[PDB]
Symmetry: D2
């Protein structure tokens, strides 16, 4: 199932993500440079998110170009964000013009891939299945990807012969 995900918007999946589902976020541009304008916020941050029916952010994926890092986290609806889990940003992107972030669902954790190469395993923190995805950025900034992304949801059986 394909979805069009515009910058600063949220899109509903067609159904809750089943066990071992796979979500691919596809860009047609790469920009690893700091945003021209920092904007009111004061922090260079663009992110994609997996959200449940209640509005909780099961997985938050932030790209911090001025900090050279990927920030993973979870955010209960209307509450503060938990402890951050970070890893270096350099050396993950930069190999192709259409960068992508792939998420592989497992019972207790999320497998995260950059341009199809696993870079981290994030332990789940909040309850409930993914039913929405969002693409957000702090006011006045410019993203590290195209301002519109292609999002595909599929299962291993799909990318293998048969129906």
């Amino acid at each position: 199932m394909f979805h069009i995900l515009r910058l600063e918007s949220t899109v509903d999946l067609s159904e809750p993500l089943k066990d071992n589902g796979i979500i691919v976020f596809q860009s047609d541009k790469l920009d690893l440079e700091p945003s021209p304008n920092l904007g009111p916020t004061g922090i260079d941050n663009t992110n994609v998110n997996l959200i449940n029916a209640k509005g909780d952010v099961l997985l938050h994926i932030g790209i911090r170009r001025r900090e050279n890092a990927f920030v993973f986290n979870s955010i209960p609806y209307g509450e503060s964000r938990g402890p951050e889990e970070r890893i270096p940003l350099e050396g993950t992107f930069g190999d192709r013009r259409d960068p992508s972030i792939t998420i592989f669902d497992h019972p207790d954790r999320y497998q995260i891939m950059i341009d199809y190469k696993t870079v981290y395993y994030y332990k789940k923190r909040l309850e409930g299945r993914c039913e929405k995805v969002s693409y957000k950025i702090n006011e006045g900034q410019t993203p590290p990807f195209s301002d519109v992304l292609g999002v595909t949801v599929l299962y291993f059986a799909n990318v293998m012969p048969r129906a």
Copy 2:
């Protein structure tokens, strides 16, 4: 290679399409109803196109909802369009929420698929390789797909094990 193709725009491929290349046009919405407003033009038409370096339209794919048909054609740069080749529109789309148009290149013709089911073989008319793709509609109308499409270019070797 993934590309983001916005309504009423043209995007350059990263390189001329090689023999037996495959181009997939992906929408996340389907609307088989006549456009609300016909607009100045007076014809309900939305189309996608394969274009060469010189600006000639090697393959034109128009969807005519009020005529219940698919119109295939070619258009030399700055010249009149040739003879139309048409087939019924009903029964091709309507099986899924994310409709797609796939084009399979062959030496002398283009294999055209709707939602991955072949519906026609169009004989090539103009010379030169595909290097651009466009998504167009007549002024004031609303498309039968999302106003942004995902376009992927690949080769058979890609969708099969190995590198």
Copy 3:
């Protein structure tokens, strides 16, 4: 649909191959050196075949290592083969140790691929859908592939998302 195809045997398909079906013959070995022994025919020949319900060989694909070329033909049941259609063997295989022959069906012709690169388009000569495949060799010789091949039958939709 996967099938095991042993040298000098014929295997039935699950059902008649439908329009645009794809058949992939996989080997885990490549040996382009000519067969040491030639047996009673005096001609180095190993072939794979697509057969219809009444015994007609719809498409015969031979590998002639002593003549540097592929040989394509059709053979009505109980009759003699028709005219041969050839292309060079050199420059097709070579870039892998697990070679494959892929046939992509079309209304009036067969698209043939070596290691997933199209090398020829064979115009159909007989009627009826393919219902069996075979792997044969001339008496007393050794083949250029493993003595057992993996055969997969699928369709374009199977290698693309959802449904």
Copy 4:
């Protein structure tokens, strides 16, 4: 990378399996009826194994048709197997006549799939990368699969576009 795996034999891989590698064991047949004969062991057992460079069985996957379950274990070279880990056999196969067992590698564990549906996560016990695979059966019995299996080694990137 494709490999032919005959019953009661061991086959080497092209190179040590890298992080996140995927190994697919394919059969063209399914027979869950118990083996008519049991031979000297008196236990109906057919298995597939992932082996390292020094003879250690990193992962042993057994099918016990008389005990209704899969048996997972590890076996250091020259030593005795460790504790068994089981799950029911019933309800895993069944929806195809060409069954497959897929192993997806992870840093600390193996994700196991039957017909492309995850059924278990086995925690690694031994060191070293997988360099060989084998297909074995207890003396005098007949297996639940074809006597020859097709084995494919690949990576996630291989089943996704470009590079």
